Amino acid sequence: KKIFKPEELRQALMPTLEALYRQDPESLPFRQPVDPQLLGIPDYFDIVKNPMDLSTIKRKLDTGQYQEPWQYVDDVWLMFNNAWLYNRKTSRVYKFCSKLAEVFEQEIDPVMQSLG
Ligand SMILES: COc1ccc2c(c1)N(CCCNC(=O)c1cccc3c1N[C@H](C)C(=O)N3)CCC2
């Protein structure tokens, strides 16, 4: 509390991120930052004001950018909400997002209870 040590956040939270990365096929669109021109979705940043992806979250854990664990939870949820905002409900990314949210819910609960 209330600025947690970065090494403690990394040790506690990284397994929850790893759980997301282990999901195949579902994590694949989330593993790298979105590049709208290269992917042919040029309106992406117009709609998605705060992009987020698994590699960025990992980098933030690795580099001590979270002061407290709810900031990490908020970035994971930002990633999910961006995908549900941008994509149509029939798309792979939308359905994959929903699966990741299921996995994350299960993983994050006991970890947050342990951190305070
Ligand atoms: C597009 O669905 C898939 C599904 C599986 C795979 C791939 C792509 N690919 C491509 C992965 C790169 N393309 C995207 O990442 C992406 C593309 C269009 C829309 C969106 C994209 N992602 C962002 C997060 C979004 O919200 N909409 C690899 C094989 C597995």
Q: What are the residues whose beta carbons fall under 8 Å from the beta carbon of 92, sequence distance 6 or more?
A: 25, 29
Are 71 and 57 contacting, i.e. CB atoms less than 8 angstroms apart?
no
Three-class secondary structure assignment of 35-92: CHHHHCCCCHHHHCCCCCCHHHHHHHHHCCCCCCHHHHHHHHHHHHHHHHHHCCCCCH
53: nearest Cα among 31, 82, 73: 31
Closest C-alpha residue for ligand 1 atom 25: 83
Domains of the chain: 1-116 (1.20.920.10)
Residue 6, CA distances (Å) to 53, 54, 76, 84, 101 in order: 20, 18, 17, 30, 24
Residues 6+ apart with CB under 8 A from 29: 83, 92, 93, 96
Backbone dihedral angles phi then psi of residue 94, each to the nearest 5 degrees:
-65, -50
d(CA 77, CA 89): 17
Give the separation between CA 22 and CA 43, rounded to whole angstroms. 29
Pocket test for ligand 1, best of 43, 47, 93 (most atoms within 8 A of CB): 93
Determined by X-ray
φ, ψ at 39 (rounded to 5°): -85, -5
- If one residue of 27, 37, 39, 92 were mutated to test the ligand 1 pocket, choosing by the most ligand atoms within 8 A of its CB, it would be 39
Of 45, 43, 24, 25, which Cα lies nearest the Cα of 33?
A: 45
> How far is the C-alpha of 8 from the C-alpha of 87, rounded, in Å?
35
Supply φ then ψ for residue 34, to 5 degrees: -70, 135
Using alpha carbons, select from 108, 97, 77 the residue that is nearest to residue 26.
97
Q: Are 82 and 51 in contact (CB under 8 A)?
A: yes
- Alpha-carbon span 4 to 115, nearest angstrom: 9
